[PDB]
Amino acid sequence: GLFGAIAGFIENGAEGMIDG
């Protein structure tokens, strides 16, 4: 479901995508 395309992008900002 579409949540899986966002959630972390709002709930932090896609942590791990920065940090990786």
CSV table of C-alpha atoms in Angstrom, one decimal:
chain,number,residue,atom,x,y,z
A,1,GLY,CA,0.0,0.0,0.0
A,2,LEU,CA,1.1,3.6,-0.7
A,3,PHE,CA,2.2,4.1,2.9
A,4,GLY,CA,5.2,1.9,2.1
A,5,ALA,CA,6.3,4.6,-0.5
A,6,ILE,CA,6.3,7.3,2.2
A,7,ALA,CA,6.1,6.7,6.0
A,8,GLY,CA,9.8,7.0,6.8
A,9,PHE,CA,10.1,10.0,4.4
A,10,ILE,CA,7.7,11.9,6.7
A,11,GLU,CA,8.3,10.0,10.0
A,12,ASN,CA,12.0,11.1,9.7
A,13,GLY,CA,13.1,11.9,6.2
A,14,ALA,CA,14.2,8.3,5.1
A,15,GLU,CA,16.9,7.7,7.7
A,16,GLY,CA,19.5,5.2,6.3
A,17,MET,CA,19.1,6.8,2.9
A,18,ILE,CA,21.2,9.7,4.3
A,19,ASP,CA,23.4,7.5,6.6
A,20,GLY,CA,24.2,4.6,4.2
